[PDB]
Structures are given as structure tokens and as C-alpha cells.
Amino acid sequence: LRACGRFFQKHQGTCFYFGELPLSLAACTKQWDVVTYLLENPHQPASLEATDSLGNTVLHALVMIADNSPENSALVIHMYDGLLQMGARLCPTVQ
Amino acid sequence: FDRDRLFSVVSRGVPEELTGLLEYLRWNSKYLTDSAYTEGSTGKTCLMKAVLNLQDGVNACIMPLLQIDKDSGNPKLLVNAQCTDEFYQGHSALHIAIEKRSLQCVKLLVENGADVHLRACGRFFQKHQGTCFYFGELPLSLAACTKQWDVVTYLLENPHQPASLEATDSLGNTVLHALVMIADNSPENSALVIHMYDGLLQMGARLCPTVQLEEISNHQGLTPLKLAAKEGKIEIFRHILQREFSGPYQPLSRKFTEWCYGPVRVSLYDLSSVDSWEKNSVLEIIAFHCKSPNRHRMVVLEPLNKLLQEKWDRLVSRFFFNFACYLVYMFIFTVVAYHQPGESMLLLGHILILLGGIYLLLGQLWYFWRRRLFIMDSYFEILFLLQALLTVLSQVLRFMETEWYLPLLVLSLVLGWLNLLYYTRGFQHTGIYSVMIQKVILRDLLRFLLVYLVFLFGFAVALVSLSREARPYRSILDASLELFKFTIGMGELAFQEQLRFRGVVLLLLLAYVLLTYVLLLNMLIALMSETVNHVADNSWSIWKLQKAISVLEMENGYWWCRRKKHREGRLLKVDERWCFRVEEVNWAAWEKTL
Amino acid sequence: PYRSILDASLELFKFTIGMGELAFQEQLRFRGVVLLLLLAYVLLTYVLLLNMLIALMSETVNHVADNSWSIWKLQKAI
Amino acid sequence: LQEKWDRLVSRFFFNFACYLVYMFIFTVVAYHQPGESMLLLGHILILLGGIYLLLGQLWYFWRRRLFIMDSYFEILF
Numbered sequence A: 001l002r003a004c005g006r007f008f009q010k011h012q013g014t015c016f017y018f019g020e021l022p023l024s025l026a027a028c029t030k031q032w033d034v035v036t037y038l039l040e041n042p043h044q045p046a047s048l049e050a051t052d053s054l055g056n057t058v059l060h061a062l063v064m065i066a067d068n069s070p071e072n073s074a075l076v077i078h079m080y081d082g083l084l085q086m087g088a089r090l091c092p093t094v095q
Numbered sequence B: 001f002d003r004d005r006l007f008s009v010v011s012r013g014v015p016e017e018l019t020g021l022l023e024y025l026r027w028n029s030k031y032l033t034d035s036a037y038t039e040g041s042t043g044k045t046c047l048m049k050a051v052l053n054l055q056d057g058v059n060a061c062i063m064p065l066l067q068i069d070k071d072s073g074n075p076k077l078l079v080n081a082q083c084t085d086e087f088y089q090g091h092s093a094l095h096i097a098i099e100k101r102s103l104q105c106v107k108l109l110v111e112n113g114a115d116v117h118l119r120a121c122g123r124f125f126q127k128h129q130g131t132c133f134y135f136g137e138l139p140l141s142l143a144a145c146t147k148q149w150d151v152v153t154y155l156l157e158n159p160h161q162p163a164s165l166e167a168t169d170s171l172g173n174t175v176l177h178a179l180v181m182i183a184d185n186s187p188e189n190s191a192l193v194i195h196m197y198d199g200l201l202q203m204g205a206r207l208c209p210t211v212q213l214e215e216i217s218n219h220q221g222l223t224p225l226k227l228a229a230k231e232g233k234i235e236i237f238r239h240i241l242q243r244e245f246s247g248p249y250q251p252l253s254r255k256f257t258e259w260c261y262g263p264v265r266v267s268l269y270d271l272s273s274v275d276s277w278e279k280n281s282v283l284e285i286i287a288f289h290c291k292s293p294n295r296h297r298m299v300v301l302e303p304l305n306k307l308l309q310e311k312w313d314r315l316v317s318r319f320f321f322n323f324a325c326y327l328v329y330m331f332i333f334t335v336v337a338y339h340q341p342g343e344s345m346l347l348l349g350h351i352l353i354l355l356g357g358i359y360l361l362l363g364q365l366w367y368f369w370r371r372r373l374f375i376m377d378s379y380f381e382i383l384f385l386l387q388a389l390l391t392v393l394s395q396v397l398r399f400m401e402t403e404w405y406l407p408l409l410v411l412s413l414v415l416g417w418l419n420l421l422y423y424t425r426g427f428q429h430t431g432i433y434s435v436m437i438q439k440v441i442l443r444d445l446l447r448f449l450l451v452y453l454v455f456l457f458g459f460a461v462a463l464v465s466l467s468r469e470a471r472p473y474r475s476i477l478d479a480s481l482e483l484f485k486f487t488i489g490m491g492e493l494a495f496q497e498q499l500r501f502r503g504v505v506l507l508l509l510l511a512y513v514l515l516t517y518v519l520l521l522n523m524l525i526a527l528m529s530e531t532v533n534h535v536a537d538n539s540w541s542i543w544k545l546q547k548a549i550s551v552l553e554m555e556n557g558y559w560w561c562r563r564k565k566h567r568e569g570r571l572l573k574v575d576e577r578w579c580f581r582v583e584e585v586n587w588a589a590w591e592k593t594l
Numbered sequence C: 001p002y003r004s005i006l007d008a009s010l011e012l013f014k015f016t017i018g019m020g021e022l023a024f025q026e027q028l029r030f031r032g033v034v035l036l037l038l039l040a041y042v043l044l045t046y047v048l049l050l051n052m053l054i055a056l057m058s059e060t061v062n063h064v065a066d067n068s069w070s071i072w073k074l075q076k077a078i
Numbered sequence D: 001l002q003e004k005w006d007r008l009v010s011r012f013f014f015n016f017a018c019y020l021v022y023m024f025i026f027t028v029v030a031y032h033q034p035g036e037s038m039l040l041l042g043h044i045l046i047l048l049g050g051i052y053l054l055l056g057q058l059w060y061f062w063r064r065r066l067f068i069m070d071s072y073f074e075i076l077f
């Protein structure tokens, strides 16, 4: 599901950009237990190659929400590596 | 049994020696409240001595002392007796008990009939610049300024005589007002005052639910929220604006969170006594009635930051229309000044600057009449008045055909162009840049001028007197002018052979040079010392204060047309209040919450 | 003196370069007032120089010398 | 020291006022140096005033002879 309202779009104002997918939302918020289950559940697994209205994937969304603060950047990097490493299991043929 | 023996035994705390006191009082038909047993210096009674002389927390002499007075048939009460000195008027034994931090004595006095509403209104307790201790004037207010929870609850809910949070002192200050005044901006002090503020306010919902403690106004007409704005105490001022509670004490909140979604929070802020629609509001107090240096930091808080921003956006068109009308008026002024001796347009131009001068004159007179109660923030308001007065005077002089009309017209043109800095505050580009001129730049320029001009006169008189004998400087005005040319880098320092004392005159001119250089370096050093100890963030807050003052003036409209004030926010049930929705996004705080 | 804006602008600018001719010109009827305007221009201009000097001064204290090496590398990178 | 200053603050300004009067006479006489009677009276006052400051400062330095920039104005006076 793609939440593409003006509140979720990135702009100068009252907004919360996290990408537009539940997988991207579960990645911007430091929620490991949610993000793995969404990716490897047997009912309907999410795909890291999914893109929002701007074409941003999960890795692109993490970059945009990443500040230069060293508390924020540590979690974004750790989330970045974990999603990238787990992507080698679910979709090895996709870079 | 005289005063000296009685004062000694109560100090030593030996009830066994107090046996003969009752017999002596009955024999002489006297009471403990009589002037014979009170120190004439202040009016201290025998009970007051006992409370300040404590052992193990309870003075065993107090109880026998109190029951003796009851047996003595005193028409007054020793417990309710107060001092009579000018400095310590109204001081009582109950005040001493709370000060000594001894709940047991406070329990003892009220059980025997202590009046909890005794008002210590002496000069020592009144707030003034000097040796004083302002805590309000009631024992309840004293028990609140001192962090004594156990005392303050018992005084409020005791079955003998319960105190009331709605009680007021000589200035009309309640318990909440007293906490505000004694509240410093230190973050150890402000934490206890806020915690005391919430606790008394919450407990007030139990003892007096029908009474709104936050809306009680003192003799100055200020609520506890308005008093914090006037006193410039931002730390407690911020908490009241953003006060939020949950559970049974939810109605006591002023900030109601509507919905929170990640870093984005939506909160309904109460605008009661805050919106500028009502007279003597918090916004008006900060801009005009407040005089603390913190008033620029209080206009950037929420909801004031968004409340003033929305007012500015509505009135930004009025600000530029006012700016455009001033540019047109000054464009006419400049053209008429230049083309002063085709005559019909000059006459029309003279009329417009005459009508314009009256318009600014009446506008500024109306402003100062409204500002007469509290008057550097009005720096341009004075200049806009002077430009109007000189323009009116110049046009009046032109009617009388006196030649001095032209100098006044030209001085008005100079002042009018300089008044254009007032409209730099309407743009973020120019507003922030022009902040650091009135605060430091303009003040220290005056310091150098006054000192330098005095000794410019001293050297000018010296040069003229010394140069009067021949082997230049014919008067003070001339000698002042030549001496001033050294400052502008055009001073003619030459060995003038026409003077008999040619050598000495050069020495005076040289001595003036380095002595003046001392003044420039001192001024440069003075300018230099505040730049290092300066915060760039203050420039943004000071500019917002300048816009805050501006929007409040335009809300009143023009002097010739008073516009109806529009109330901000909307009436929303939260118990319905005129709340103001504020949308706030904070990634840093949200991530720390995760 | 001061026959036009271009002339009057030039004489007023000479004060900034330290060559301003501040004299009591007897040829003018309002000789006293003209001097007051010239004097008022001097301190008012000095306010502008000091404000600019203060503005220049405030970023030097809050400056990092390491940025100069990185900015130069960006210039070479471009 | 604050209570001593409050008691002697009137003496400080009286000393200041006497110096302003003395310098006002000094400035007038210096300017109007070559009606002659007032100039002669003005010359006498600055002569008597000069001796007064001379004797006052000599007495000060005699008492300060044991321990001598804090006396910067004492030298100038």
C-alpha cells in the first residue's frame, strides 16, 4: 500500500516523509521485528525493490530521513546494512 | 513573674518553671498579649520566642503556654498576635513555625486556634530593592515558597481551620501569584516552583472545584499567567502555556494533543488571556508592559510563535502598503525639496507633505497617548514624531515666508529617509541584519561623542587663547572644526610660523591626536568586547519581537479608522475553549523517544 | 559647492576615503545648518563602518581553519 | 565601604563642584586674556586655587611617601 498524500510527501512544512510503503515505514522507524516479518512472511512477503511515487526504494528512503546527527546516522547505517544483507537472501539476483 | 523571666524560660523550654505564670497573671489581671510582655522594638510576644527556640522539633513549653492564656481569659489570642514594627508588621508565630520547617509546631498552633489567614505585611515582607523576603503574605504562601509539601497540604485540608488557595495578600497576590514572583530562571529553582505550581493547582481541583485559581486577578489585574509575562520569568511562563495533564486533572491542561504520528504532533493550545483580541492580554504585556531582557525569548515560544506568525501573514500586506505609502510620501518630499525655488505641482507637492506631516503627527501622538503608561523599543516612534513635527513646522514657516523654512524642510528630508530602517523588519533578509545596531552600535557611539566633545571644547579654547599672539583658530567654532578634522583624517597639522608660540601650539595639537586616539581605541575595544560575548540566535528572537510589536500595533488599525479585532482560533470542546491548533514536527525529540 | 547630486555624492564619499572637506563655508546663507548635516553624515556613516566591521568580526571568531583546506579541495575538484 | 561612601558622597560632589567652578574661572580667564578688574580677580582666584591644589597634593604625597598607576591622577593634579 502506497501512502502518497501531501502529508507524506517531503516538502517544507508539516510532513512526515518515510517513503510511502509499510516496509519503508518499518525501516525509518527503528523496528527490526516488524521489518523482517514483513519481508519473509509466508502470507505476503514485501520486496525491497518496491518503489514509491518518486521511485525511492527502502534504501533511498533511509537516506532521505538520515540526518547528520550521530545518534540518527548510527541507526540509519545499521538499518541500511541489515536490509542490504537480508536482501542478499530474499533476492540474490537483484542488486 | 516579669518579662525577662518569662522570656528566659520559654527560650530554655522548661515547662516546670512556668507554673507561677498563671498565678501572677490572675493576681495582676494581665494577659500575655499585653504590651508589658512584648518587646517594644518589634512587638514580639512570648509565643514567638518559643517557636524560634526549638529542641528535637517540638518545644515542650508551647502547649502549657497556650493553655495558660486560655485560662487567663484573654479577649485576644496569643496565637493570633502579630508584631507591630514597620518592617515586621503582621509577623506571627505561625509564620515562624513554617519557616523553621517543623510541621509538629504548625500542627500544635492550629489545634489551639491559629488563624491560617494571618497577613504579614511589614516592609521586610514587601517586595522591594533591599533587605526583604517576599513570599506572599500568608502562611499558606510561605509554606509554598519554601518547598514544604507536608505543611502545605495539612494547612489546606486540616479539619480545624482549612486554608484557601483563593486568599490574597495586600497586593492581591494569591498562592499561585506568589510562586511566580519568587520563581527565578535558574533551572533548580524553576523545577521546584513548577512542581509546586502543578501540585497546588491539582489539589485546588479537590478543595474548590468551582473556583478557577488560574483566573484570579490581583490588584494590577494580572492573572498568574499574565504576571509571569510581565515579570519576564520565561521558565514558569513556558510551562503554563504548554501545561498538559492526563486523567482526572485533564481539564486543568492548556495544551491538548489532538493526534501524534511519528515526529509530527498536533496540539490544541488554549488562547484564553493569550490572544490579543482581549485587552491586557499576554501578547500585549510582553511587547509593551514587560521590561525584562527576556521578553524577546518569550515571543518565540508556542503557541506565541505560531500565533504571531499567523497574525503577521494576515497583516503582511498592510505592512507593505504602509511601506509603499511612506515611499510615495518621501518620493514627493525629495522631489519638492530638490525643486525648491511648475509652481502648481510644487504647491500641490507642498500640500501633500503638509497633509502627510499632519497624518504622521496625529498618528504618532495617538500612539504615544496609548503608550503613555509604559515608556529603546520606541526608537523609531520618536523619530517618526520628530519628522512629522519638523515637516509641519517647516510648512507653517513657509506660510510666514521666513527663510528658516528651508533648513527645517531639509532636516525633515534627512530624518524621513533615515526612518526607512523601520520597514527593514518586514523582511527576514534585512530584519535579522539590522538587529545588531540599536542594541550595541548606537549606544556606544553616544558614549564616545559626549566624552570627546567635552575635551574638544577644552582644546578649542586652549588653541584660540594661545594663537591670539602673532610672531588661524579665531574662535571656538573654528578651533573646534580644525580639531575635528583630525578625527575624519583631514586635520592640518603644520608648523604655523605666524604664531609667536608656534612650538607650543604644535604640542597641543599633537597631544590632542594621541589623546583622541585613546578615545577611538577605547570605543573600538568597547565595541569589540560584546561581539565575542554574543549569541547569534538572539538576533532571530529579537527580530521576532520587533515583528510581534508591529503586528500588535497594526491590529489596532489606523488612528482615523479603528478596525474591529478578529479573534484567533476557534471554539472547540476539550468544557469548550477558544483553542489554537499548532502543528509541530520534531525528528530529534521523536528519535530520542524511540 | 554641491551644485548637483553627482557632485554632492562625490564630496560626501570623500569622507569615507578620509579626504572629506569639512569646512565652514561662508558662501552659503545656511552655513551653520549645512555643517550640521555634514557632521550628522559623519557619525551616521561611522555607524555603518562599525556595523560592517562587527559583522566581519563575528564570523572570524566562529570559524574553523580546517574548512579552508576542504573548500580549496572542492575548488580543485570542480 | 558602601556606608562610608554614602556618608561622603556629598563631600565628593562638593569637591567636584568646587573643581568645576575653579575650571570655569580658569577657562574664562584663559579665553579673555589680552573688564581688567574681573580678569585680575580671575587671575587671583586661579592663583589661590593653584596654591590650594599644590598644598593639597604635596600633603598627599608626603603621607603617601612610604608606598608609591593608582596615583595617576594624583600626579596630574
Ligand SMILES: CCCCCCCCCC(=O)OC[C@H](COP(=O)([O-])OCCN)OC(=O)CCCCCCCCC
Binding pocket: B321, B322, B323, B324, B325, B326, B328, B329, B355, B356, B359, B360, B363, B380, B381, B384, B422, B558, B560
Ligand atoms: C498611496 C498614496 C499615498 C500618498 C501619501 C499620503 C500620505 C501618507 C503619509 C504617510 O507617510 O503615512 C505612513 C503610514 C504608515 O506608517 P506606520 O503607521 O507604519 O508608521 C510606523 C511608525 N513606527 O501610512 C498609512 O498609515 C497608510 C496611508 C493612509 C492614507 C489615507 C489617509 C486618510 C486620512 C483621512
Ligand SMILES: CCCCCCCCCC(=O)OC[C@H](COP(=O)([O-])OCCN)OC(=O)CCCCCCCCC
Binding pocket: D014, D015, D016, D017, D018, D019, D021, D022, D048, D049, D052, D053, D056, D073, D074, D077
Ligand atoms: C565654591 C566656590 C569655590 C571657588 C574656587 C575655590 C578654590 C577651589 C580649588 C579646587 O579646585 O579645589 C578642589 C578641591 C577638591 O579636590 P580633591 O581634594 O577631590 O582633589 C582630588 C585629587 N585626586 O576642593 C576642595 O578641597 C574644597 C574647596 C575648599 C574651599 C575652601 C578653601 C579654604 C582655604 C583656607
Ligand SMILES: CCCN(CCC)S(=O)(=O)c1ccc(C(=O)O)cc1
Binding pocket: A007, B258, B259, B260, B261
Ligand atoms: C487527521 C490525522 C489522522 N491520522 C494521522 C495520520 C497522518 S491518524 O493516523 O488517524 C491518527 C494518528 C494518531 C492519533 C493519536 O495519537 O491519537 C490519532 C489519529
Ligand SMILES: NCCOB(c1ccccc1)c1ccccc1
Binding pocket: B428, B429, B430, B433
Ligand atoms: N540583494 C539583496 C541582499 O539582501 B540582503 C540579505 C540577503 C540575505 C541574507 C541577509 C541579508 C541585505 C542587503 C543589505 C543590507 C542588509 C541585508
